[PDB]
């Protein structure tokens, strides 16, 4: 599919921060909410997202948590607000890297707080706790080991780790759970793989290469249906401004987003992709 002549084309993944403000709430979050009361808004839900994974950790004064994969900063702000802890966050986005560290610049704290471009596999200091949202999906699997073994290793004897990431069922799941995958399904697999590489875990891969790095998975709980409510929001909110999408991109760039968006709220509602918080212990 290589072409000879190189040719500078326009990527979805070039599109600026302003572009992503047309369309997630306030707090930049791009990844599932949780509509812990069904009359929340997107930004509470996201809130309550982080606090639901924050909680999780046991976090004490003074302890440092690290954030795997800390997308444009809303989960290390409600960190850095709600307890009294050091904070480490690290991304290979340098808008993201330049977004976050601005944004955390801004809030009083008596701890320390650092935001890093860099790699899980780059990063060897030693944190009490882990939280991880939305990362995990663009690990390639053949790394799947070193991440658990990366991220056991830094944490101590009560370490604790929460892991957000999506996840998709075998096709025997699909068959008993009454779920018929169509061609239109089928394709927009394949505009997944032309635009987004590599296949989703399932639920029991993560449960087997947690316990293979030697933590025990104490719980997992799964949003599907909150993403599909998140994503439906985030349509709806592309789609209201779509003239300033088109004037600040193109057209084409609008409807590869709009695509992508009711493509994932499609597999979500229809029960083909879920989405989990795992609870991993040290
Ligand atoms: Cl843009």
Same mark, same amino acid.
């Not at 326009?10 to 047309?22: G, K, M, N, T």
């Not at 944190?127 to 830094?154: C, L, N, P, W």
């Not at 590599?198 to 030697?214: H, N, R, S, T, V």
């Given at each position: 599919?290589?072409?000879?002549?190189?040719?500078?084309?326009?990527?979805?993944?070039?599109?600026?921060?302003?572009?992503?403000?047309? &369309?997630?709430?306030?707090? /930049?979050?791009?990844?599932? %909410?949780? +509509? =812990? !009361?069904?009359?929340?808004? #997107?930004?509470?839900?996201?809130?309550?997202?982080?606090?639901?994974?924050?909680?999780?950790?046991?976090?004490?004064?003074?302890?440092?948590?690290?954030?795997?994969?800390?997308?444009?900063?809303?989960?290390?702000?409600?960190?850095?607000?709600?307890?009294?802890?050091?904070?480490?966050?690290?991304?290979?986005?340098?808008?993201?890297?330049?977004?976050?560290?601005?944004?955390?610049?801004?809030?009083?704290?008596?701890?320390?707080?650092?935001?890093?471009?860099?790699?899980?596999?780059?990063?060897?200091?030693?944190?009490?706790?882990?939280?991880?949202?939305?990362? &995990?999906?663009?690990?390639? /699997?053949?790394?799947?080991? %070193?991440? +658990? =073994? !990366?991220?056991?290793?830094? #944490?101590?004897?009560?370490?604790?780790?929460?892991?957000?990431?999506?996840?998709?069922?075998?096709?025997?799941?699909?068959?008993?759970?009454?779920?018929?995958?169509?061609?239109?399904?089928?394709?927009?697999?394949?505009?997944?793989?032309?635009?987004?590489?590599?296949?989703?875990?399932?639920?029991?891969?993560?449960?087997?290469?947690?316990?293979?790095?030697?933590?025990?998975?104490?719980?997992?709980?799964?949003?599907?249906?909150?993403?599909?409510?998140?994503?439906?929001?985030?349509?709806?909110?592309?789609?209201?401004?779509?003239?300033?999408?088109?004037?600040?991109?193109?057209?084409?760039?609008?409807?590869?987003?709009?695509?992508?968006?009711?493509?994932?709220?499609?597999?979500?509602?229809?029960?083909?992709?879920?989405?989990?918080?795992?609870?991993?212990?040290?």
């Amino acid at each position: 599919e290589l072409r000879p002549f190189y040719e500078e084309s326009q990527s979805i993944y070039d599109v600026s921060d302003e572009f992503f403000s047309l &369309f997630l709430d306030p707090t /930049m979050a791009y990844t599932c %909410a949780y +509509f =812990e !009361r069904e009359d929340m808004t #997107l930004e509470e839900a996201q809130n309550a997202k982080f606090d639901l994974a924050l909680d999780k950790l046991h976090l004490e004064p003074g302890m440092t948590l690290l954030d795997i994969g800390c997308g444009w900063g809303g989960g290390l702000q409600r960190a850095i607000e709600n307890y009294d802890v050091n904070v480490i966050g690290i991304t290979l986005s340098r808008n993201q890297f330049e977004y976050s560290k601005a944004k955390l610049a801004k809030i009083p704290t008596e701890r320390s707080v650092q935001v890093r471009l860099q790699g899980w596999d780059e990063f060897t200091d030693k944190v009490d706790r882990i939280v991880s949202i939305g990362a &995990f999906e663009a690990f390639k /699997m053949e790394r799947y080991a %070193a991440f +658990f =073994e !990366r991220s056991y290793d830094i #944490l101590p004897d009560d370490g604790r780790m929460l892991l957000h990431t999506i996840l998709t069922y075998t096709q025997k799941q699909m068959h008993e759970m009454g779920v018929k995958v169509t061609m239109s399904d089928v394709r927009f697999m394949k505009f997944i793989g032309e635009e987004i590489g590599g296949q989703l875990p399932a639920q029991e891969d993560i449960f087997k290469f947690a316990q293979a790095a030697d933590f025990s998975v104490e719980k997992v709980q799964l949003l599907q249906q909150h993403y599909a409510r998140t994503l439906n929001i985030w349509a709806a909110n592309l789609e209201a401004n779509k003239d300033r999408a088109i004037a600040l991109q193109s057209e084409e760039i609008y409807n590869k987003y709009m695509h992508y968006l009711t493509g994932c709220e499609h597999f979500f509602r229809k029960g083909i992709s879920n989405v989990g918080q795992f609870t991993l212990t040290k």
